[PDB]
DNA sequence: ATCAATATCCACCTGCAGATTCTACCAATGTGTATTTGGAAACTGCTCCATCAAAAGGCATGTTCAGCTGGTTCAGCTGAACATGCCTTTTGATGGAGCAGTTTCCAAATACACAATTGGTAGAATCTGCAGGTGGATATTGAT
DNA sequence: ATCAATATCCACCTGCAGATTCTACCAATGTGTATTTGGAAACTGCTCCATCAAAAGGCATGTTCAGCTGAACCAGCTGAACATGCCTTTTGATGGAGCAGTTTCCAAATACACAATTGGTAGAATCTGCAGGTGGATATTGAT
């Protein structure tokens, strides 16, 4: 259950940066759901790229191609 | 070099090559990569300008990603252009909603 | 050890950097950001140029196309000033040749 | 002793954290989570350290942004508190959720 | 005579209008609104009739959609009633504004 | 070499009832007073944008007439794709 | 068989798709397997949509499929709806759907 | 002046799926446009995959990894399959 | 206010490594040939604009009052603050080799081109669905 | 309730044209040469993965109580519903040609190739910013 390694205080800090004051109880779990969906999606794609590439190792560029597919474009990792 | 001929720091050759081997279309006129390496030079310059002023503001000589993020999200037209873009090591524009401020 | 040639924009960006702020520098991370920036922007403009080609059933990408791409892609004042720097550099290369 | 009213350390936390750019989630649990989520798509894979970092930046981006939009949704209800129906509203409009 | 309570003709309307596909905005005032918005962009234009229709479809789509997300915002406020602060939250989250 | 009428604020031809109906179809019950003006504000922003781009395409094309395809390329540009007019 | 769709048993032309892939500048060289596999995937998705809209038209008691039917067909299905997420359909209409708390008490 | 469309092949496939049902012109416009949007989507993705992997050529293999990327879930499955099937029957004969 | 206590701000300095300056290697990136894309001019015809009268259907406008908004109060409790107590994240370390990436061979796969031929187009003809209408059964809302 | 009444729902019909089928014209779409891409095998080495051992720093767990949430209630009023009066939209009609799209010619512009040389790469060295920190400057926060 590595999904719980996303600590309550990490999500608390994340919300802090997001400009939030008071956080409900359920929120943490709800966050944890969302986050997963995200990662599931992106990685699903990133990995696909790695498979097309007939490589066993996922490279930062696969990540980026995926994120660009998702419309979430990332700068600074070799785009 | 053709950049010297057009007064650019940016290689017009490299961009001629890129337009040819990206398969954007069969024939790349000679004027295209020029106009283009120019437009990139301009926008590079623009970002570097605004980010640089932002970098002098926090009293540093080196531009670090945070400066760039700031410069982009602060400028309006640039911010529109980079809307779907996430900048690594960026941070946010420090901004608090008014109604959470102690009254 | 061995070498593997890679390609980047960090040098031209140093140049342009020194032009704008002679007394200021740039970190590695930030330079990666600029490199990416140019690349994304590039791909965007050239993409749209390409679409203009095929829309108009044309085998060639003229600077004329780069231009209409920049009017479409770039917002407002940014658009006006880029169209300038471009038309400018191209007329200068034109008379130079 | 000394005790600050509820909400103050929040505001100071907000200023403090919005002002830096450093990675908020512990990297290892995140890395384990990424390797797990990847196991089920394809088994026996390897990860460039730069690619994991890349994802971490992508996800902390995602979440902080979603939070901005959440806070704005609860503030729409005359509430200072974010809740699961707020987040489901954000995602529901962005198009993320059905 | 007969008078329906507030809200009854509302729901009878929602049903009625959700059930069809025909254009709600009368075509002429929309066509003047498009020829006007183009006039002042580049002067002396002509419009294929299909282009007028395409625009009408695109815009009524945009707006019907925006109204749905509006409603979901006002219902989140425990209100049956939509307001500009609602619409503006919708656009604020979508990224438009 | 032959006149036009001038065109001015045709934006009010988007009648209150057109905006009411468009609101019904959106599953809305009670509409505030302000909404109409605000609707229009938004609608205009929309059109300006779309039509800008569409005309830019007609201008690249050295045509004086805007075609459905131009409209469509525009909408597809904005991320709003339209089906049925010739994409 | 002579034509290539016949050879791979399809109603969608594998030739026209070869032509389009080549004179679209997607890349220099277009393999012999690509327009095949592709005219196959297009055929397939055309088929899925037509099935769902056709059943939907039978539901409203009609012989001809009209855009409203297609709009329905796409939006009721979960996966067609995700794929066509950003797409607006000519003459579409919406999914008849009313919010609960606006319904009479 | 000759124009080109998919309306004939979409008639084909319609008759395969529902023999007794018909289709209007606007609707056909929707379909033709649809097929086209999709085409550009997949072929685009294929292309990007080429240049990502430094390959001058678009193999059926690329179309495929495109269809896995672009299509969500069960649809991706039945499609990748309908394809493999079509290419394999194509190869032998 | 006016008053203390944590918390933050900024000052100064120093060292560490990551930015920046320099070195030599090397592979991309002017003139000459041959071909063709599209700019230009000359013409054809489609469809877009203008206008008009009549038909009517929907917009606008005013009255009237229902139920919906938000202003107010008020109890419970659910999160925040703060300390103490526990553990695993971080970092630095070395070792091991999985495997990504670079090169050379070279043949299977496509680009390229001419001559053939048929599926796909448009245009025309036609006919079956259903849009438009009307009445008439039924279902819902609000009034008593 | 029980009751009318407005509206919706549903069925046939009836006439029109839009889907759809017949037809003939025509332009994309079997075989042989030529070139090179990548698959395939062979080796090199980058950094990714393992387990490991200290150093604290961060997470966790709990107590205590503050203020936020929402349930509930109440006054004002703002937006719905309805009719009637009016206006402007729709239709189709025609007429007129702006001008879009199709055609045919001629060249300026780019692709192709060979051959030469220097800007741009990696690697090494060196050096200047600023992180890290410590200690009082100075700004809030909570209590008086």
Please report, rounded to whole angstroms, the spatial distance between the CA atom of protein residue A60 and the C1' atom of nucleotide I22: 32
What six digits make up the tokens of B12? 């017009």
Burial (CB < 10 A; 0-12, 13-18, 19+), residue A55, is middle
Residues, chain H: 93
CB–CB of E25/F22 below 8 Å? yes
DSSP one-letter code for D43: S
As ranges, strand I nucleotides with an atom below 7 A of a protein CB are 5-9, 18-20, 27-30, 37-39, 47-50, 58-61, 66-70, 78-83, 88-90, 98-102, 109-111, 118-122, 128-131, 141-143
Relative orientation angle of helices E49-75 and E27-39, to the nearest 10 degrees:
100
Q: For residue H24, how many other CB atoms are within 10 A of its CB?
A: 14
A42 CA to I42 C1' distance (Å)? 58
Answer whether F11's CB lies under 8 Å from F44's CB. yes
E7: region left, alpha or beta (phi > 0 left; psi from -120 to 50 alpha): left
CA of G27 to C1' of J122 (A): 32
Cα–Cα–Cα angle for H49, H54, H57, rounded to 5 degrees: 70
For H2, counting Cβ atoms within 10 Å of its Cβ (0-12 exposed, 13-18 middle, 19+ buried), the class is exposed
Joined together, the tokens standing for residue B10 give 């940016």
Find the CB nearest E21 among G91, G97, G99: G91
Buried b (16+ CB within 10 A) or exposed e, D32-69: ebbeebbeebeeebebbeebbbbbbbbbbbbbbbbbbb
Two tokens at D87? Answer: 């987040």
Distance CA G40, CA G32 (A): 13
Cβ(H81)–Cβ(G80) below 8 Å: no
Task: Kindly report the number of other CB atoms within 10 A of residue F17's CB atom.
Answer: 13
For residue B47, what is the domain's CATH number?
1.10.20.10
CB G48 within 8 A of CB H74: no
What distance separates the 2 farthest-apart alpha carbons in chain C? 51
Do the beta carbons of residue G10 and residue H45 sit within 8 Å? no
Q: How far does the CA of B76 sit from the C1' of J32, in Å?
A: 62
Q: Taking Cα atoms as reference points, which of H45, E12, C42, E27 lies closest to residue A75?
A: C42
How far away is chain C from the Cα of G51, in angstroms, using its nearest Cα? 32
Measured between alpha carbons, how far is G85 from A18 in angstroms, rounded to an integer? 28
Contact residues for F65 (Cβ-Cβ < 8 A; gap 6+): E45, E46, E47, E48, F58
Is the dihedral angle over the CA atoms E32, E38, E41, E45 positive or is it negative? negative
Burial class (CB within 10 angstroms; exposed 0-12, middle 13-18, buried 19+) of D73:
buried
Contacts E–F by Cβ distance under 8 A: 175
State the residue range of the domain holding C16.
3-97
Return chain C residues 16..55 having CB < 7 Å to nucleic acid strand I.
Answer: 25-29
Q: State how far Cα F45 lies from the chain centre.
A: 9
Token pair recorded at residue A15: 């919300």
Q: Beta-carbon neighbour count of residue A46 at 10 Å?
A: 28
> Does residue F36 lie within any of the structural domains?
yes
Residues of chain H with C-beta less than 8 angstroms from the C-beta of B17: none
H or E element that contains F77: helix F68-78
Q: State how far the Cα of G3 lies from the Cα of G39, in Å rounded to an integer.
A: 13
Round to whole Å and give the CA distance between E62 and G86: 11
Q: Tell me whether F46 touches chain H (CB under 8 Å).
A: no
Across the interface, whether the CB atoms of H53 and A53 are under 8 A apart is answered yes
Residues D49 and D62: their CA atoms lie apart, in Å, by 20
Full DSSP string of G11-32: SS-HHHHHHHHHTTTS-SEE-S
Please give the tally of structural domains in chain A. Answer: 1
Contacts of range E46-50, beta carbons closer than 8 Å, 24 or more positions apart? E46/F64, E46/F65, E46/F66, E47/F65, E47/F66, E48/F65, E48/F66, E48/F67, E48/F68, E50/F67, E50/F68, E50/F85, E50/F86
Which residues, including other chains, have CB under 8 Å from residue A73's CB and lie 6 or more apart?
A: A67, A79, B84, B85, B86, C40
Name the residue of chain D whose CA is nearest to B101's CA: D11
Task: Look up residue A42 and give its two tokens.
Answer: 């992106």
The SS3 call for residue D82 is: strand
Q: With H, G, I as helix, E, B as strand and everything else as coil, classify residue G87.
A: coil
Task: Map tokens 């191209």 to a residue.
Answer: C90
Start-end of H helices in D1-98: 8-19, 27-39, 49-75, 84-94
Structure tokens that stand for D24 in this block? 């908020």
Closest CA to E42 of C83, F48, G75: F48
Q: Among candidates G24, E93, A36, A12, which has minimal Cα distance to B25? A: G24
State the burial class of residue F68 (Cβ atoms within 10 Å of its Cβ: 0-12, 13-18, 19+): buried
Question: Which are the contacts of C22, defined by CB distance < 8 A and separation ≥ 6?
Answer: none
Burial class of residue G68, CB neighbours in 10 A (0-12, 13-18, 19+): buried
Say how far apart CA H10 and CA G62 lie, in whole Å.
19
What SS3 string covers B56-92? HHCCCCEECHHHHHHHHHHCHHHHHHCCCCEECCCCC
Task: Tell me the C-alpha to C-alpha distance, in Å, between residue A22 and each of B47, B101, D13.
Answer: 36, 12, 12
Is residue A63 helix, strand or coil?
helix
Dihedral sign for Cα E76, F47, C73, B67, please: negative
CATH number of E1-97: 1.10.20.10
Tell me which residue range forms the domain holding B59: 1-103
Token code pair at residue B61: 């000589």
Backbone angles phi, psi at H76, to 5 degrees: -60, -45
Residue E74 contacts D, CB cutoff 8 Å: no
CB of residue B5 closer than 7 A to nucleic acid strand J?
A: no
Residue G22: exposure state from Cβ atoms within 10 A (0-12, 13-18, ≥19): middle
CATH number, span D1-98: 1.10.20.10
Take residue B50 and report the two structure tokens written for it: 């605004």
Burial of residue C7, with CB atoms counted within 10 A of its CB: 0-12 exposed, 13-18 middle, 19 or more buried:
exposed
d(CA E43, CA E52): 17
Distances (CA, A) of C24 to B48, B53, B55, B91, H47: 10, 10, 8, 22, 40
- Buried/exposed B43-82: b ≥16 CB within 10 Å, e otherwise: bbbbbbbbbbbbbeeeeeeebbbbbbbbbbbebeebeebb
Contact H37 F85 (CB under 8 A): no
Write the DSSP assignment of B2-64 as a string of letters: HHHHHT-SS-HHHHHHHHHTTTS-SEE-SSHHHHHHHHHHHHHHHHHHHHHHHHHHTT-SEE-
Closest among G16, D22, A9 to C29, alpha carbons compared: D22
DSSP annotation string for chain E: ---PPTTHHHHHHHHHHHT--S--S-HHHHHHHHHHHHHTTSSS-EE-HHHHHHHHHHHHHHHHHHHHHHHHHHHTTT-SEE-HHHHHHHHHHHT--
User: E-assigned strands of A1-79?
Assistant: 22-23, 57-58, 74-75
A2: CATH: 1.10.20.10
Give the CA-trace dihedral at F19, F22, F28, F31, to 10 degrees.
0
> From CA E90, how far away is CA E70, in angstroms rounded?
6
Neighbours of B103 (CB within 10 A): 5
Of G82, G80, G75, G30, the closest CA to residue G56 belongs to G75
Task: For residue A55, give Cα distances in angstroms to A48, A60, A63, D48.
Answer: 10, 13, 14, 12
Query: In 10 A of CB H76, how many CB atoms?
Result: 17
Give the residue among B68, B43, F72, A65 at the shortest CA–CA distance from C45: B43
d(CA D80, CA D11): 12
How many structural domains are present in chain G? Answer: 1
**Partner F, chain E 11-40, Cβ-Cβ below 8 Å:** 11, 13-14, 16-18, 24-26, 28-30, 32-39
Long-range contacts of G51-55 (CB under 8 A, 24+ apart): G51/H17, G51/H18, G52/G76, G52/G77, G52/G80, G54/H14, G54/H17, G54/H18, G54/H21
C-alpha pair distances (Å), B90 with each of A38, D37, G91: 20, 26, 44
Cβ proximity of B45 and B39 under 8 Å: no
What is the per-residue DSSP string for H5-63?
-SHHHHHHHHHHH-TT-EE-HHHHHHHHHHHHHHHHHHHHHHHHHHHHTT-SEE-HHHH
Say how far apart CA D18 and CA B69 lie, in whole Å. 13
We report the CATH number of the domain holding residue C60 as 1.10.20.10
Instruction: State the DSSP string of chain C.
Output: --------SHHHHHHHHHHH-TT-EE-HHHHHHHHHHHHHHHHHHHHHHHHHHHHTT-SEE-HHHHHHHHHHHS-HHHHHHHHHHHHHHHHHHHHH-
Nucleic strand I within 7 A of Cβ E27? no
The length of chain F is: 87
- Chain C nearest-CA distance from G15, in A, is 20
User: C-alpha distances in angstroms, E19 versus B38, C41, D20, G53, G103?
Assistant: 54, 44, 52, 16, 17
Tokens of F34: 């302000």
Integer Rg of chain B from CA: 19
Determine phi and psi for A57, rounding to 5 degrees: -120, 130
**Other CB atoms within 10 A of residue B5 CB:** 16
Angstrom distance (rounded) from CA D65 to CA H64: 34
Q: Smallest Cα–Cα separation from B36: which of B65, B12, B57, B14? A: B12
If you search the block for the tokens 């649990």, which residue do you land on?
D29
- For chain B, give the number of residues: 103
Pairing outcome for strands G64-65 and A74-75? unpaired
DSSP per residue, C17-33: HHHH-TT-EE-HHHHHH
Contact criterion met (CB < 8 Å) for H69 and A61: no
Q: Which two tokens stand for residue D40?
A: 């089920």
Neighbour-count burial for C50-81, b at 16+ CB within 10 Å, e otherwise: bbbbeeeeeeebbbbbbbbbbbbbbeeebbeb
Query: Is B103 in contact with D24 (CB distance < 8 Å)?
Result: no
Give the pair of three-digit tokens for residue C23. 């007394």
Specify whether the CB–CB gap between A28 and A11 falls below 8 A. Answer: yes
Q: Chain B: residue nearest A22 by CA?
A: B100
Resolution (A): 4.0
Q: Which domain holds residue F33?
A: 8-87
State which residue of chain F sits closest to C44, comparing Cα positions: F77
Q: Is D95 left (phi over 0), alpha (psi -120 to 50) or beta?
A: left
Q: What is the DSSP string of G26-84?
A: S-SEE-SSHHHHHHHHHHHHHHHHHHHHHHHHHHTT-SEE-HHHHHHHHHHSHHHHHHT
Half-sphere exposure at residue D6, Cβ-oriented, CA atoms within 13 angstroms: 4
Distances (CA, A) of H48 to B94, C43, D36, H56, H69: 37, 11, 28, 11, 12
The pair of structure tokens assigned to A28 is 């943490």
* H49 close contact with A: CB closer than 8 A: yes
Length reported for chain E: 97
């Amino acid at each position: 259950d590595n999904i719980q390694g996303i600590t309550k205080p990490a999500i608390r800090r994340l919300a802090r940066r997001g400009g939030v004051k008071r956080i409900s109880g359920l929120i943490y779990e709800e966050t944890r759901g969302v986050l997963k969906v995200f990662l599931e999606n992106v990685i699903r794609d990133a990995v696909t790229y790695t498979e097309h590439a007939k490589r066993k190792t996922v490279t930062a560029m696969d990540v980026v191609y995926a994120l660009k597919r998702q419309g979430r474009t990332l700068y600074g990792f070799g785009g | 070099t053709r950049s010297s001929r057009a007064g650019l720091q940016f290689p017009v050759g490299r961009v001629h090559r890129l337009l040819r081997k990206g398969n954007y279309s069969e024939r790349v006129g000679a004027g295209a990569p020029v106009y283009l390496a120019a437009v990139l030079e301009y926008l590079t310059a623009e970002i570097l300008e605004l980010a640089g002023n932002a970098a002098r503001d926090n009293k540093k000589t080196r531009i670090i990603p945070r400066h760039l993020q700031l410069a982009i999200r602060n400028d309006e037209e640039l911010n529109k252009l980079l809307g779907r873009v996430t900048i690594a090591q960026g941070g946010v524009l420090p901004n608090i909603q008014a109604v959470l401020l102690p009254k | 050890r061995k070498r593997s040639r890679k390609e980047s924009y960090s040098i031209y960006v140093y140049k342009v950097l020194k032009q704008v702020h002679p007394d200021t520098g740039i970190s590695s991370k930030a330079m990666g950001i600029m490199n990416s920036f140019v690349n994304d922007i590039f791909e965007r403009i050239a993409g749209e140029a390409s679409r203009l080609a095929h829309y108009n059933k044309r085998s060639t990408i003229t600077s004329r196309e780069i231009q209409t791409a920049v009017r479409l892609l770039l917002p407002g004042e940014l658009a006006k000033h880029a169209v300038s720097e471009g038309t400018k550099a191209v007329t200068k290369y034109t008379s130079a040749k | 002793p000394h005790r600050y009213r509820p909400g103050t350390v929040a505001l100071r936390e907000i200023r403090r954290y919005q002002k830096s750019t450093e990675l908020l989630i512990r990297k290892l649990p995140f890395q384990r989570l990424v390797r797990e989520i990847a196991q089920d798509f394809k088994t026996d894979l390897r990860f460039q350290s730069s690619a994991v970092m890349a994802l971490q930046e992508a996800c902390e981006a995602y979440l902080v942004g979603l939070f901005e939009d959440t806070n704005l949704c609860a503030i729409h209800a005359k509430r200072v508190t974010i809740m699961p129906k707020d987040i489901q509203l954000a995602r529901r409009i962005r198009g993320e959720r059905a």
